[PDB]
Amino acid sequence: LIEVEKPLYGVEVFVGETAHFEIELSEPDVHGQWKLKGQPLTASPDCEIIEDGKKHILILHNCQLGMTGEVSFQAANAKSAANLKVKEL
């Protein structure tokens, strides 16, 4: 049973830029999963999730307009929720 020493942070992006979401836990050895408003997509060509356990870092690139929601991370018993909005050019 761990918690979230550092929650996420709402960030803006101009479709194409790169969003950033960090969050520290309490115990290493684990694997959560980020999800927009609440949709578990799948790290692909437009998703760059790099986490080494004891730490979790997200890196979304050219984010579309849909991403207009909140980044709620899920892991063991921790749960964060930042704000993210995709603005057009």
Side-chain angles (χ1 to χ4, degrees), residues 9-86:
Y9 264 53
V11 78
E12 323 177 25
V13 39
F14 246 25
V15 175
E17 251 154 270
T18 336
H20 254 162
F21 294 105
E22 283 148 28
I23 177 150
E24 238 159 63
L25 310 191
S26 237
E27 300 202 342
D29 174 63
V30 149
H31 43 202
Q33 215 155 15
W34 302 61
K35 144 163 105 214
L36 288 150
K37 192 215 226 325
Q39 257 264 59
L41 52 154
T42 16
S44 302
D46 244 288
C47 207
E48 254 221 78
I49 276 174
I50 245 171
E51 61 181 277
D52 231 61
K54 53 153 128 181
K55 258 241 192 183
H56 289 296
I57 297 154
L58 180 87
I59 291 171
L60 264 154
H61 284 266
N62 128 26
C63 316
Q64 228 118 65
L65 220 77
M67 282 208 175
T68 333
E70 20 189 294
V71 157
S72 63
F73 180 56
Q74 239 207 342
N77 146 46
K79 227 206 276 201
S80 60
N83 258 356
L84 174 68
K85 314 189 170 187
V86 158

